[PDB]
Design a protein around this ligand. Sequence first.
Ligand SMILES: Nc1ncnc2c1ncn2[C@@H]1O[C@H](COP(=O)(O)OP(=O)(O)OP(=O)(O)O)[C@@H](O)[C@H]1O
Ligand SMILES: [Mg+2]
Ligand SMILES: [Mg+2]
Ligand SMILES: [Mg+2]
Ligand SMILES: [Mg+2]
Lengths: 114, 152, 80, 66, 177
Amino acid sequence: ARIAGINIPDHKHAVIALTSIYGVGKTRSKAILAAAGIAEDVKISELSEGQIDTLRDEVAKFVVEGDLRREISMSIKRLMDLGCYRGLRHRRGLPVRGQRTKTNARTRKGPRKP
Amino acid sequence: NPFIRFEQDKKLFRNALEVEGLTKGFDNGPLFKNLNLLLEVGEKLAVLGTNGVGKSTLLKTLVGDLQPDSGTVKWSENARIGYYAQDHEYEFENDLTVFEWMSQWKQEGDDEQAVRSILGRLLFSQDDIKKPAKVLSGGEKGRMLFGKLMMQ
Amino acid sequence: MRSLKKGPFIDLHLLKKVEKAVESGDKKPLRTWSRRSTIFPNMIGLTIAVHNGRQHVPVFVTDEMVGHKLGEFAPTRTYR
Amino acid sequence: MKKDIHPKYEEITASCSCGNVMKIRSTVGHDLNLDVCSKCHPFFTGKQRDVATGGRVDRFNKRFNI
Amino acid sequence: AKLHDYYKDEVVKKLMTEFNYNSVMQVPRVEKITLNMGVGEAIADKKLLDNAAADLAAISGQKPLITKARKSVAGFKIRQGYPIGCKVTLRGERMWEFFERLITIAVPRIRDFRGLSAKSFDGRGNYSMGVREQIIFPEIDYDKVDRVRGLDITITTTAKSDEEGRALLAAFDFPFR
RNA sequence: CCAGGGCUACACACGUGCUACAAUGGCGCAUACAAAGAGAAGCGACCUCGCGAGAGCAAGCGGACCUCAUAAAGUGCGUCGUAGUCCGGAUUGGAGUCUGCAACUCGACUCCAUGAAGUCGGAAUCGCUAGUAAUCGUGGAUCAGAAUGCCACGGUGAAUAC
Ligand SMILES: Nc1ncnc2c1ncn2[C@@H]1O[C@H](COP(=O)(O)OP(=O)(O)OP(=O)(O)O)[C@@H](O)[C@H]1O
Ligand SMILES: [Mg+2]
Ligand SMILES: [Mg+2]
Ligand SMILES: [Mg+2]
Ligand SMILES: [Mg+2]
């Protein structure tokens, strides 16, 4: 239907349709449906507007697409400009949890370039 | 020699299409009754008919010419289809010039340079770029249809 | 001390040393070999010097650096 | 004007979520409801409340359970 | 219009008392509002200029004029006659209506509202402003849009001083700093 | 002799492995069947608490009885219908638990969110002839904490040898 950012996917189970929201995964999507009184098996298409209306406000209790990306970028910016270790690792594009960079860490470094 | 080169945009996998229920007839009766076929990706079909057995209307149904008995015609998901129907007249029943007519489908990233190089590759000249579309020969219209199949 | 049940950690030598400093405020940079100790909000405005292995580098304290352990602000290994 | 070359311009009644009835002309033709306009916008408190993130001193002190 | 009668009723008195005028026809008044977009690139996609003109016409119900390159500047590969942008000039009733329906609903829709700067003046009392995007107007419904094209608005008034131009737009409840 | 750091550094290359790229599968509910092995500043039931790692009181046993310890592939039912997908789980932000003087360099694990490459892999190359390969789980040594490695056990169980 239409939720905070956008809810494109109809024809999918509601419990797994709200997972297209940047901030709702699987355990929260299960919780929100139970809180709003909607079961899990019921498809989003079958949902009359008397249900999705309560879904557009339930997500307001969790930080979501509208603000979540701003906070994460702000969160990373705080460490990057701080000068601490995890800021330095972000600055160079290297692993920040303290793991091997001798051979692995293709995901963080990037594609294999000579 | 026309430097025709067809290039895919986003390739697909597994089944290209699935068609079941195929039954349709207009006057004499159902030309084909309950035709079942499945096409994997990369397949090439050669569906020849010999003058009036549905050899073109089956393709028209597959591309979309509705109301068959077939209720289970289905395409792939990211599917993009290019169509070359045997009637090039209707697509040129219009007073559009050749180049602007080719410019109905310049995709996001294609410019004047690309839309005109795709026909310059087809040895069409800017000499001829200013002529109305409905004045080209049968082979010239057919090759322009390839110049349209390239774009999509 | 990596649990709320135990409590935030600082070494005794550092804890008594910082207490004397705030008694007279900001002074000459504090040289310390402690890197395993958290940063308490009682030493905001100091320029303590941690030892990365070969030298003492001065780390400036700020309200933002109040939950990070001291060694975080001294790169121990050089690179390019 | 120049005899029907412009998009159609007619009076519409676009209202806000806080009421706010306005008689305006627009080239939409379908009534619109939207967020708060400048008639009731938080242009004096929307900025004073924006600074809320920042400061780990109080976060450390609330974690001081020991 | 509504804002026109608001002006003629009360802003005349406000500015007259604030600047000790002696004639009605001496108070500064808005004379035109010109909103344009320089699409930059149309040589690549000649139709994108058409779409930009359509966006501007949707924003303000007047068919835009397509303004073409003046001199063949060599930096960006253009020559004389190339269509470069589109422009709409609004006067009278349409001017007042667009001014009102901008300042009331279109301005607050900008992300991270701050309030428009007070130093955006040319020095003769004429204001200029950007939007950085056009979705903030109620006339775009997320269907044909492909780019994030914006506008450039110049409110040209008969004010003869920067201070008078400040006060004229201040008296209209402008979102200033 | 001691405090701190390095042995964990990263434009790259090679070797041994784990996880996958899904429909002879993913998830949810319910439920059968093992063998071997360990334990005294040790194994830790029961009950309560915590969404969970786990915390509290806390029986039993130096042991064919007490604990680890609910085995899993499977079976029955339901949904997902070929999508980078209810496949994949890296990476990253935040919130935590346990050892341990001490977890930043540099531990394991848990909760929420994010969701990368990957849609059967070039030349080439490895193992296996029967309870074998393949596939699924449990245990032990080392060990305060910390294995996809090492050592050992069982369940299902092939194709082919002219
Ligand atoms: N709309 C129609 N009305 C009447 N008869 C039709 C119609 N469409 C097709 N037919 C007839 O049905 C048969 C289907 O012929 P079809 O259109 O497939 O042509 P073809 O000769 O098989 O091939 P091609 O069109 O590719 O040259 C022909 O006998 C044709 O006359
Ligand atoms: Mg030592
Ligand atoms: Mg080593
Ligand atoms: Mg890929
Ligand atoms: Mg161990």
